[PDB]
């Protein structure tokens, strides 16, 4: 919708309800992903490359604490290549990484705020 309406505050309030905390949810950004190659923060490198055993950020954030709320702040700024991964996060509820382990988002909450419109009905 518009700016300043409090979308992120609604998400933090929702996380405040069913956790009695406010920082246990998983916020990431979509403003740091303006180029093509930074997709691999949330996957991990294939076998043979520099950071391999460390794993993915978004993947490791769910193998522990598998009940989080996941945010995507201002998902417009990412040029249309990050969208190919959350095309398959949704509707299957799985994602894989370098090790071939399969995380499962089958009881998480996906909340992805946007910024478009802003003046129309």
């Amino acid at each position: 919708g518009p700016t300043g309406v409090g979308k992120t505050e609604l998400a933090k309030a929702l996380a405040d309800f069913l956790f009695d905390d406010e920082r246990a949810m998983v916020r990431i950004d979509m403003s740091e992903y303006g180029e093509k190659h930074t997709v691999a923060r949330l996957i991990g490198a294939p076998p043979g490359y520099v950071g391999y055993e460390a794993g993915g950020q978004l993947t490791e954030a769910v193998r522990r604490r598998p009940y989080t709320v996941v945010l995507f702040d201002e998902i417009e700024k990412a040029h249309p290549d990050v969208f190919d991964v959350l095309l398959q996060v949704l509707d299957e509820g799985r994602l894989t990484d370098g090790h071939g382990r399969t995380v499962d988002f089958r009881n998480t909450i996906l909340i992805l705020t946007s910024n478009l419109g802003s003046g129309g009905s």
Binding site: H37, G48, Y49, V50, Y52
Partner: peptide, 26 residues
């Protein structure tokens, strides 16, 4: 009037290996 009969022994210590971890250079 017994003897000594100096017995033998066997030794072992293995080796390591390294991995190179190429960098994609962009």
């Amino acid at each position: 009037a017994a003897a000594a009969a100096a017995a033998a022994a066997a030794a072992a210590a293995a080796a390591a290996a390294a991995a190179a971890a190429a960098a994609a250079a962009a």
